[model samples]
Target chain A: KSDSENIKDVKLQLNYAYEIIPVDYTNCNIDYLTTHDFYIDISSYKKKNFSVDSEVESYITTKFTKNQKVNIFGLPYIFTRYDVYYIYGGVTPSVNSNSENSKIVGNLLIDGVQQKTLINPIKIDKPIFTIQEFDFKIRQYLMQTYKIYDPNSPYIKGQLEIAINGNKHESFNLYDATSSSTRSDIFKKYKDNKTINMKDFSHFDIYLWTK
Target chain B: KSDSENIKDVKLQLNYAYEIIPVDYTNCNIDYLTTHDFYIDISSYKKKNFSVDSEVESYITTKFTKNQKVNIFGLPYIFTRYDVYYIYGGVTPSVNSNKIVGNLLIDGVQQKTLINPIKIDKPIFTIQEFDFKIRQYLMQTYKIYDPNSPYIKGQLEIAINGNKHESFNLYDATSSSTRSDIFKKYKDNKTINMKDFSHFDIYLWTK
Candidate 1:
């Protein structure tokens, strides 16, 4: 039968409000940051999201999302939240020339995921903070365990796109970005493959719920 | 060295308040259930802090925490609650008897690590339900993971505690039992652990 299963005695720890780790790269030509450990450019295609895009007809467009499991190390968490980072290097596939842009790293880890690329407008509205929105998406994933003799969604499972959104509301204790502590309440879900017009924010937070 | 390195754009599901299943024990001649799924038992195991003592009388005492990271199947979760049941033909060993006036697998799972069976008192609570204390305990676990990762506690590693427990809570869950979910909030962890506890008849929550 199609059902959800709770992990048995699985110890997934939720910090009071945040997973705080500070790495300063203000002096570097550029730096990349996210809610997760910053992987060096050497570990990636380039190193930084430092690239320029001038060609209106040859601008860079990239989209990527990784399957993440919450844990301090390689452990499985029944309920957990995570912050991640991605450096961008926009380049036109046809052209060989490239340039650098500002880094895409946020200032802290409790700021869960990057909703969209930082908008580079002539004018800036919120000088420091980004907007939060419903970004949960669903895709067909294969189910390994929790299967009955025969069940619907048998070949693969339809993941419930649980949209999570928030920021480092540390004073309110949403996330203790300074130290490692976090507290939260659920908002809503984004469902599968919807446009999620919910205004993309420069920043966000990840919240976890367990059985 | 001590950090939670969650990469980008990965499918991280398996988070919820509860996931329940019903089994027909009407015909349960002897055994009921056993596995890591249940963490309940009946005994004088409860204390002031909401932690339980094992009926098996072993050196180890396993307790669930609120901030604990659990692997359901494989995905990770950020919240969870405790629920337990019992089985038959198992043993709930005490320091004194091969039979503590009953058999093992009393309600569903063992009271402690040593598999100390229990006497089948009608369940006093429901599955997947516990007091705020249980939730509070879980909350601190996450702190241990990131806020206070030491070099030795395997700060980077999640502990695998195949802990078990039992309680009257499960029995009371069904309408057939003495208690119901509507009055769950009023139940205290300390009272539930003691045999001297009284009827948990407080009701709230509109239908």
Candidate 2:
């Protein structure tokens, strides 16, 4: 046995899930709505940790999960699985603080229970000409205010690299984003070039492992 | 009145929505699960439909909507708005034809009813090591088998171009996919160059 202790294994896991609910309007009234939900969970299990003995073994794992349920007109509709769309049209749509047009109220729930409720989650007080216009308005709200997971966002995928076997290193993608580049090119840049610094990773959730 | 009958307004509307559910496992049993759902509805109402009188003013509009609900142990959960996650893990995860491991059953519901239920949606008969592995397997099943709308797919966005004012033309994006390209360049290519063939648009969900 060697006198010096070595960092054995380093691993990373990422779990993410998202859903989209499209509610259509007609004559300022809800026509129909649909929802689509999906999840992408990934992990990089085989890697050597290059750290001192004092460093504690770390399993860098991150989980981002969200579930949105809407109760319309006191009716329970679970927006789970598949994708759904609600198209609103047939009459001009208008929104106001009073009960003039259609009123949409929302509540946050945890495990089939209510956490907090909002009178108007979208906070809109305007007139919408067509269902398409209303759809766009909701899209803006979902991405900016609601903070829904936008698949187009750059953060959808992440990069990971770690130093291993003293002088050598390994690098790979946490989630495949763009298919234009090849893995050989990635390995060449991070591994063959020998440019990996133990502390260079920024976007990754770094962890320290110890014996 | 002039002898020419002009083609008036050309409008296009697209409505879309999606949802995601993640179930985690530990020691082969489901720990918890969550769901998320959102929608994007858009319309372009102010545009000239550059078509001959015989072409008939076409209002190119498309609507795509779907809803999926799953029943777990006779319990009801509507995966509507927001995002939720269900993680599973307790014992080593294993799969078999029989009721050895956790089995997931799905059904197609419309207007709070069932259309056709699926016994085993994922169709698996193997062993899973970790929640992460099971998650990845489910992800593959979702993107491939389920045929869910992939935002990364090229069809997520569409391009529109139409000849206007006899010789003038215009072009714009239905859904902004890339921020790298400028609107000026897109306009210059299809507008200034007069390359608007009126029929050059192919990638679009042509009406």
Candidate 3:
């Protein structure tokens, strides 16, 4: 029997929310920000409707039908108004270059399309944070979707907050940069004193608040 | 400025508890168990009373005055009854032979005395677990104090649950074994499906 089968009364779901803020790290000023919400309904596994991707997409289409604005950090911001980005689910297991076998991996998604597979496992000791790099393809996507150039400006950063069974759990700090120097510099400036090292940042295509 | 100084309105404390069952893993049965409570009050740093060891000891002496029995996992168990073991706080930073620099480390204590300085950094990816080997010295102490022989028996394992700001955050499964084979076998059996690797267990000498 699978682990899910053994679980009878345990209703488990992993819910995560990200408040991505576009900042002028040079000045440390927050102009505007966006919030994204996604979750993994582990309980669905017991019901025989256990496709992580379909589960997440169903949640997005039903619950987050339209974008809305709310006051955050004492400022107004949009919550999942234009685009959606989230982790679909873990894919096939494979070994990394380090000869370590990966487990519980998932694919990064945007608007129900697969963008990247998150092979790098996230450590749970602290909040999980990463920089979202806007490469050429992402830059082009933002230009066509939001009609903005270099939407994230010189840099962008976000913090991840997770909850289990509707209870507040852990919080992680996210940083964004375009170069290795800025990456290292940001790591020094904002990295948790408890955080010993930084993991590789995952790049994703999404719309950012420019005003 | 230090990270703690940057905080003006935020209050953070890492609270952890363990419901350790004296299980016959061989039989999949739980006869008796114990629960322990300890916390790291990060807010103390703002008040200049930030010694992790003293803070933990004060909390224990004041809060956990006597032994009490409570129902857990559908059975009654003693909570911080006769003995107490906890992580006091992180001490001076040091580098391991693997060339990795340890961070946010602490010393494991039993009854306000230094037992072991936990040099190994725990990966947050999953729950932390270790085997409490009852060495000859520990056996002698238990016999004299608790009047019990091999109190923990051939093997003992525990699960760690952590909360922040009084809300459940994460849960980790802990295992106990006597040798490396048992360790490897238990890792394969109870390790979280999502956990990638097992960390080295820490050994503490405390009464």
List, for all models, the DockQ compared with the true complex: 0.02, 0.05, 0.01
lDDT of 3 at A209: 26
* Model 3, native contacts kept: 0.00
Residue A26, model 3, lDDT: 11
Looking at candidate 2 chain A, the ten consecutive residues that score lowest on lDDT are A7-16
Model 3 chain A weakest lDDT span, ten residues long: A9-18
Off by over 4 Å in 3: A1-39, A43-211, B1-207
Residue lDDT tens for model 3, A1-211: 4542211111100000111112101101112212322222222212322211111112222322222211111000111111211122111111122122223233443444555654422321112212221122222233333333222332132323322233433344332333222112332322111111113322222322211
TM-scores (chain A) of the candidates: 0.16, 0.21, 0.20
> Please, what is the TM-score per model?
0.18, 0.19, 0.16
Query: How many backbone clashes are present in model 2?
Result: 77
Residue-level lDDT tens digits of model 1 in B60-137: 112222223211110011111121122211122121211112112212332223221222232222122222212222
CAPRI accuracy category, model 3: incorrect
Off by over 4 Å in 2: A1-102, A109-116, A123-140, A150-211, B1-184, B187-207
**Can you write out model 1's per-residue Cα lDDT over A149-177, one digit (the tens) per residue?**
11222211111122224532321122112
**TM-score: the better of candidates 1 and 2:** 2
Superposed on the true interface residues, model 1 gives a C-alpha RMSD in angstroms of 15.5
Error of 2 at B183 (Å): 5.3
